[PDB]
Amino acid sequence: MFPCLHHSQNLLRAVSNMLQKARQTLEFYPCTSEEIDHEDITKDKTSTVEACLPLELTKNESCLNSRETSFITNGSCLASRKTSFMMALCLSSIYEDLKMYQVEFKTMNAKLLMDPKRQIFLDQNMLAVIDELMQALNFNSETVPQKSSLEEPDFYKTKIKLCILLHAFRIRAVTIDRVMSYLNA
Amino acid sequence: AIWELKKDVYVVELDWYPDAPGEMVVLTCDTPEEDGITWTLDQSSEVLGSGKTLTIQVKEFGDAGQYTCHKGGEVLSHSLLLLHKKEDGIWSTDILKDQKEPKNKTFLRCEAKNYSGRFTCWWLTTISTDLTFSVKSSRGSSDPQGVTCGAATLSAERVRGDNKEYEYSVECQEDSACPAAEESLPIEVMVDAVHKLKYENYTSSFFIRDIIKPDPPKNLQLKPLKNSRQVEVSWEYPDTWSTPHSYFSLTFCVQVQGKEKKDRVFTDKTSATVICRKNASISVRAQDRYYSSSWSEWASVPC
Amino acid sequence: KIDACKRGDVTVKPSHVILLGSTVNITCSLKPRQGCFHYSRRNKLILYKFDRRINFHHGHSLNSQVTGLPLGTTLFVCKLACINSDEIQICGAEIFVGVAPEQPQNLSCIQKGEQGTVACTWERGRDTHLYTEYTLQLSGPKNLTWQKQCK
Ligand SMILES: *[C@@H]1O[C@H](CO)[C@@H](O[C@@H]2O[C@H](CO)[C@@H](O[C@@H]3O[C@H](CO)[C@@H](O)[C@H](O)[C@@H]3O)[C@H](O)[C@H]2NC(C)=O)[C@H](O)[C@H]1NC(C)=O
Ligand SMILES: *[C@@H]1O[C@H](CO)[C@@H](O)[C@H](O)[C@H]1NC(C)=O
Ligand SMILES: *[C@@H]1O[C@H](CO)[C@@H](O)[C@H](O)[C@H]1NC(C)=O
Numbered sequence: 001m002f003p004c005l006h007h008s009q010n011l012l013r014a015v016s017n018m019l020q021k022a023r024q025t026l027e028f029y030p031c032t033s034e035e036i037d038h039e040d041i042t043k044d045k046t047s048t049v050e051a052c053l054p055l056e057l058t059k060n061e062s063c064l065n066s067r068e069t070s071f072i073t074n075g076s077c078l079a080s081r082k083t084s085f086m087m088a089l090c091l092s093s094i095y096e097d098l099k100m101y102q103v104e105f106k107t108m109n110a111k112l113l114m115d116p117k118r119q120i121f122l123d124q125n126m127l128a129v130i131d132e133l134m135q136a137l138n139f140n141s142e143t144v145p146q147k148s149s150l151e152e153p154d155f156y157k158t159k160i161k162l163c164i165l166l167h168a169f170r171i172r173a174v175t176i177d178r179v180m181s182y183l184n185a
Numbered sequence: 186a187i188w189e190l191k192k193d194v195y196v197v198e199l200d201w202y203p204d205a206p207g208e209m210v211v212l213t214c215d216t217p218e219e220d221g222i223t224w225t226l227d228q229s230s231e232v233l234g235s236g237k238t239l240t241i242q243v244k245e246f247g248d249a250g251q252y253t254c255h256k257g258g259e260v261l262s263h264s265l266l267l268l269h270k271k272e273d274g275i276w277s278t279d280i281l282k283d284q285k286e287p288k289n290k291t292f293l294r295c296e297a298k299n300y301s302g303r304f305t306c307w308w309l310t311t312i313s314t315d316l317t318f319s320v321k322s323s324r325g326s327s328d329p330q331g332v333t334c335g336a337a338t339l340s341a342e343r344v345r346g347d348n349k350e351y352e353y354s355v356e357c358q359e360d361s362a363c364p365a366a367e368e369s370l371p372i373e374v375m376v377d378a379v380h381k382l383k384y385e386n387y388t389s390s391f392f393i394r395d396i397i398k399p400d401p402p403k404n405l406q407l408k409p410l411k412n413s414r415q416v417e418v419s420w421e422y423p424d425t426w427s428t429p430h431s432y433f434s435l436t437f438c439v440q441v442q443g444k445e446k447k448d449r450v451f452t453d454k455t456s457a458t459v460i461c462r463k464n465a466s467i468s469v470r471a472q473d474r475y476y477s478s479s480w481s482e483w484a485s486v487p488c
Numbered sequence: 489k490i491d492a493c494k495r496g497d498v499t500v501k502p503s504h505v506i507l508l509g510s511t512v513n514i515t516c517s518l519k520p521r522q523g524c525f526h527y528s529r530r531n532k533l534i535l536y537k538f539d540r541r542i543n544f545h546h547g548h549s550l551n552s553q554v555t556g557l558p559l560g561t562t563l564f565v566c567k568l569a570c571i572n573s574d575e576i577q578i579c580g581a582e583i584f585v586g587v588a589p590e591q592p593q594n595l596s597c598i599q600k601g602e603q604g605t606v607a608c609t610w611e612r613g614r615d616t617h618l619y620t621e622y623t624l625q626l627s628g629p630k631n632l633t634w635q636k637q638c639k
Contacts, residue, residue, distance in 0.1 A: 063363040160492035
């Protein structure tokens with residue numbers, strides 16, 4: 001049993017439940033996988049797409065581009081002398097992916113609360129799981145400050161952006177789960 | 186408009202309504218200049234036009250065919266003509282048939298069995314002869330020579346109704362050397378169906394994970410527990426499925442209904458224990474554990 | 489920057505928040521680069537309220553003036569229908585019709601026991617269909633006040 005793998009399995013399950021709630025709440029807003037384009041915020045910032053691979057799959061090492069964002073932050077999920085750099089860079093990039101998403105999700109939630117009705121709001125449990133996993137991934141975890149606005153934003157745009165992020169995040173959550181399973185075995 | 190599908194082949198786009206005027210079509214020959222070039226459409230020596238240039242509006246299919254560039258008694262060049270009918274401003278779709286299983290207007294159905302990127306696409310067409318297909322593929326549009334599609338082959342000749350639909354399939358492998366954990370661009374496959382003087386094209390966009398269909402579970406065996414009614418059943422991962430088996434995982438659903446309505450049990454473990462009625466079979470199915478995928482064929486061992 | 493609206497942008501006059509009784513000019517505009525791939529006089533630019541057709545213009549610029557909107561939120565979504573392809577949602581606007589907030593007629597503050605936390609209760613009045621922020625201020629003999637907001 002791997003504790004980070006348990007957190008990652010909790011993350012994928014939490015996103016799956018939130019995604020189901022989002023489809024039910026926003027009946028008109030189009031939130032089916034077919035009608036929602038895949039857009040990834042972390043497209044160029046992080047190297048999870050390349051660094052997070054089984055050791056057998058990655059060989060030439062040429063594609064790792066000049067140790068891109070090679071922070072290699074030390075953390076409680078692995079041990080400093082336990083695994084190869086290929087997994088050390090991957091764990092740092094996964095931490096960065098969760099930081100980029102959590103900062104955005106909190107911004108969306110703060111705008112959603114202002115709605116006169118409560119049609120939809122991001123799951124507090126899902127946000128807590130993202131923070132718990134980041135704390136294990138990197139010791140120098142930064143907790144996002146409470147975000148708020150002094151004005152009211154258009155709600156339709158936030159609800160379309162929300163659906164686009166949730167689906168992309170779910171794909172990211174499976175990718176983290178596969179890496180955690182590989183680390184355990 | 187007039188565009189060249191390939192050298193010596195020119196597809197002409199024509200509107201399809203009664204009493205329609207044809208587009209002015211100009212024929213040119215890339216040969217050393219000859220005074221007196223003659224032009225034929227049919228194999229017959231009826232001569233259509235003289236000069237290195239021939240003008241003929243393609244008002245109907247009869248006016249489309251292999252115009253021949255011949256002078257001096259030697260055929261200088263060749264000018265095959267292909268037609269892309271457009272009806273009410275909508276491109277014709279007659280060569281292939283609408284399966285409709287995913288949704289309406291679906292003529293291409295693709296599938297995969299591994300994360301390697303090897304995939305096969307099946308299209309059902311009811312035209313028995315004079316049929317040719319051109320297949321090209323790429324990841325998004327950025328990858329040049331991204332995918333190496335193979336050549337169409339007839340696969341089956343079933344008798345649905347009396348039409349006898351024939352199924353043609355292509356084998357395509359992602360030729361990208363760099364391994365990547367997640368796909369950001371959908372693979373796009375284009376089939377340029379050609380029949381006689383009629384040209385049609387079909388485009389399908391998809392992701393490998395969505396089209397993946399696992400092969401049936403391997404080495405299924407039943408081992409009765411000593412002095413107990415229940416029987417332990419053990420199965421193994423398919424060799425064809427991508428490795429390592431830790432990063433890529435499958436979920437096994439076991440149904441014991443054989444021949445009470447639903448004995449299906451979903452077990453991640455490779456061995457599950459089920460009471461075995463003497464008069465039934467035990468069957469196992471495989472699906473991608475991580476994402477929703479097409480279910481595998483049932484693997485049945487007599488019990 | 490994830491963008492919810494790419495094919496086109498929709499504007500509302502004066503604003504998404506309007507007084508009960510006012511009329512909004514929802515105008516759906518399509519960027520020139522985006523549009524129906526094949527020009528045809530069959531494709532339309534529909535505008536729907538709760539998926540109900542209110543207008544349709546072949547041209548990229550569509551203008552509408554909805555009136556008598558009731559209290560609440562109405563989702564006006566402006567989809568593009570091409571000749572054979574299915575409708576693609578382009579952009580939409582959510583309008584919250586609201587009214588001026590009710591004043592609290594009665595305010596009572598009660599402290600439970602000699603040692604207690606002061607609690608003040610008010611009659612909100614009619615619910616305005618809008619986000620409501622309540623501020624309670626307590627001032628003593630001279631002017632020194634405690635500020636608390638019930639968001
Ligand atoms: C699928 O079939 C359609 C039907 O012809 C193809 O659209 C046509 O594509 C050709 C090739 O680009 C166009 O001809 C040439 O286009 C270029 C670029 O615009 C231009 O420089 C040439 O002068 C000539 O126009 C043709 O205009 C176009 N037809 C229409 C109505 O747009 C399409 O390419 C086919 N796709 C595949 C993958 O085969
Ligand atoms: C709405 O637009 C029409 C024409 O564009 C104009 O005549 C009218 O005054 C506008 N009304 C408001 C409230 O903006
Ligand atoms: C206290 O505030 C009230 C209202 O602002 C004002 O009328 C009064 O003069 C103030 N008293 C002092 C001592 O400032």
